[PDB]
Write a protein that binds this ligand. Structure first.
Ligand SMILES: *[C@@H]1O[C@H](CO)[C@@H](O)[C@H](O)[C@H]1NC(C)=O
Ligand SMILES: *[C@@H]1O[C@H](CO)[C@@H](O)[C@H](O)[C@H]1NC(C)=O
Ligand SMILES: *[C@@H]1O[C@H](CO)[C@@H](O)[C@H](O)[C@H]1NC(C)=O
Length: 607
């Protein structure tokens, strides 16, 4: 169609399948294998990207151009890399991915949304769609096209270090929350074939349903471990939300480190090719997790030639290497040259990778849009995160006896009040893992509002607000306080670091609560990624709120504490009496919860 130097795959008006086919048929083996390779920005240079025809880059947690980098520094870094890829013979743009799992959370100044567990407590799929929408804008503000989200694991044992990344122990809740997909990507057209990949354009990002499959069902919630359950249980609990993801056009799927009945997901041909591709008809690309193929073996990385063969024959399209690309590429090249991996397998992986790229508009907008930079931490997004924070809170107790005046909502006008606790004035702690660093961090790590700051923002100008991190019982008794707000709970963690068999919060926590509540009426705010041993904290407290990991917008906490809105959150998980009961899920054997799934007390808005 026209000028003599015309190349079909470069023609923006052509159908995606035709462009895919036209480009694929021009490619060398090297160009093909390069598309299947995703590398860390830490090992990328212009020469490496060109010489190896690299298909994709990522930032792992905390992999940033520098601390405190602006939206525009992110764009320039991404464009720098894109420039190199666009200079190859074929000029295939790379796609850059990142873990934007509660906002664009590696980035300084990015809005930080509550983690998924508290989103589950909202029972509000449309709220979650708006979060996907705002997250898309803030990822594009940094010039990135692909978010590794949503995690649609169904956590069945809160001892799991990634339990907070699961919306619920109940698959129906997880299914409903797959509305993050068309928020991140855009709504699919009414026509739309299930399993097709979709992204609306340059103001959206490709999403990723992860981690396929049963990552939530591991023995004793050990991370990356074995999920032991018959096919029926797998299909009834852990598989369903994958189909909702197919119907909403999720562009990519990430495979689990975990195994199903002793079989590593990263080597599972039956599930990856047989079920996901051949039965659900998924047509986007399938991506490994980080060194996912290495971990097929024991020890990890002890037979990488086998890691490559088994993962690629299982049906994975793109490998998150992410460091040793030369080895990955060499080994995959040798296996193809030797006839051990047929060309049809390579061609299918590349068809799928290219189909996502063409579909999302990546050949038409390979470069960042500088006018999107101001989306980062936009106040409208913060307002949305604040709403989400507030709706996620679950009120577990509001008064020690049925006859006490209920403590909450607290009055904004009082002569003198106490705010106390390790978590009352610690932004890092209220955000939890995957914020700025991989493991999260402590203190003022980004822009936001701590519980202390939110309290001072909320109260009457005549209310004197006293902060004390760990006050003793005397200080409280002598302080002339009207009430206290005390915030305690878990430290930040992610995945294996967070596997925890005792689920009891660190001290000083309980002791501060006892000291405070022994002197004056107290509202205890529990910051956690999951249910934790809570009876002693309940016994001390007049009122107690499960706030999960509410993110950067602490005024969501105080919006409810002070009665601007009623509490509406409901437990998206079972609250256990003791860890010895675990695992224990709604519908189970002898199901004996402290608070059942769906439990939450309510209040009404003041005035
Ligand atoms: C699960 O964890 C145990 C205990 O650390 C380990 O020996 C075993 O290899 C793991 N099983 C997996 C990953 O399938
Ligand atoms: C609970 O387990 C965590 C990590 O698994 C550990 O840091 C903490 O000290 C433990 N508490 C106990 C054994 O009381
Ligand atoms: C909260 O609203 C409901 C319905 O209007 C009512 O049952 C309850 O008594 C209300 N108010 C308070 C202060 O508890």
């Amino acid at each position: 169609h026209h000028a003599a130097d015309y190349v079909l795959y470069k023609d923006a008006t052509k159908p995606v399948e035709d462009r895919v086919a036209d480009l694929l048929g021009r490619m060398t083996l090297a160009e093909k294998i390069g598309q299947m390779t995703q590398i860390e920005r830490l090992v990328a240079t212009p020469d490496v990207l060109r010489d190896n025809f690299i298909g994709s880059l990522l930032s792992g947690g905390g992999s940033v151009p520098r601390k405190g980098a602006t939206a525009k520094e992110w764009q320039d870094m991404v464009d720098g890399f894109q420039k190199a890829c666009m200079s190859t013979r074929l000029g295939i743009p790379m796609i850059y991915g990142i873990d934007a799992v509660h906002g664009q959370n590696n980035v300084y100044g990015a809005t930080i949304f509550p983690h998924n567990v508290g989103l589950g407590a909202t029972r509000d799929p449309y709220l979650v769609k708006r979060i996907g929408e705002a997250t898309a804008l803030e990822v594009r503000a940094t010039g990135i096209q692909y978010a590794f989200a949503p995690c649609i694991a169904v956590c069945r044992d809160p001892r799991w270090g990634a339990c907070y990344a699961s919306y619920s122990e109940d698959r129906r809740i997880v299914q409903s929350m797959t509305e993050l997909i068309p928020g991140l990507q855009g709504d699919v057209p009414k026509d739309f074939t299930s399993g097709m990949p979709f992204v609306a354009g340059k103001n959206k990002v490709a999403a990723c349903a992860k981690h396929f499959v049963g990552d939530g069902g591991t023995v004793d919630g050990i991370n990356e471990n074995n999920t032991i359950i018959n096919r029926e249980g797998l299909m009834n609990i852990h598989m369903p939300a994958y189909k909702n993801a197919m119907d909403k056009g999720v562009s990519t799927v990430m495979i689990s480190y975990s195994s199903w009945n002793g079989v590593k997901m990263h080597a599972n041909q039956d599930l990856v090719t047989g079920y996901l591709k051949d039965t659900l008809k998924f047509k986007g690309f399938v991506i490994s997790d980080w060194e996912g193929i290495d971990r097929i073996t024991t020890p990890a990385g002890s037979d990488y030639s086998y890691s490559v063969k088994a993962s690629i024959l299982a049906g994975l399209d793109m490998i998150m290497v992410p460091n040793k690309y030369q080895q990955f590429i060499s080994i995959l090249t040798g296996h193809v040259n030797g006839g051990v991996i047929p060309m049809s397998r390579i061609d299918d992986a590349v068809t799928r990778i290219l189909r996502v790229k063409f579909t999302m508009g990546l050949f038409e907008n390979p470069y960042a849009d500088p006018a999107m930079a101001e989306q980062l931490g936009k106040q409208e997004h913060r307002d949305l995160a604040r709403e989400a924070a507030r709706k996620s809170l679950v009120l577990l107790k509001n008064g020690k006896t049925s006859t006490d005046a209920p403590l909450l909502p607290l009055p904004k006008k009082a002569p003198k009040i106490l705010v106390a606790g390790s978590h009352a004035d610690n932004l890092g702690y209220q955000c939890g893992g995957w914020t700025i660093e991989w493991q999260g961090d402590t203190g003022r790590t980004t822009v936001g509002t701590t519980i202390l700051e939110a309290v001072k923002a909320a109260v009457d100008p005549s209310t004197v607000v006293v902060f004390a991190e760990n006050p003793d019982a005397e200080f409280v008794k002598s302080g002339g306080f009207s009430y206290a707000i005390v915030a305690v709970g878990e430290h930040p963690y992610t995945e294996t670091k967070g596997d925890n068999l005792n689920l009891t919060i660190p001290e000083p926590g309980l002791s501060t609560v006892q000291a405070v509540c022994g002197g004056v009426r107290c509202a205890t705010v529990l910051i956690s990624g999951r249910p934790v041993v809570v009876q002693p904290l309940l016994a001390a407290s007049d009122a107690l709120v499960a706030a999960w990991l509410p993110g950067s917008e602490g005024q969501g906490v105080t919006d409810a504490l002070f009665g601007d809105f009623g509490f509406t959150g409901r437990l998206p998980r079972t609250w256990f009496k003791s860890v010895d009961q675990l695992p224990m899920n709604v519908g189970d054997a002898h199901y004996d919860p402290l608070f059942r799934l769906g439990y939450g007390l309510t209040t009404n808005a003041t005035k």
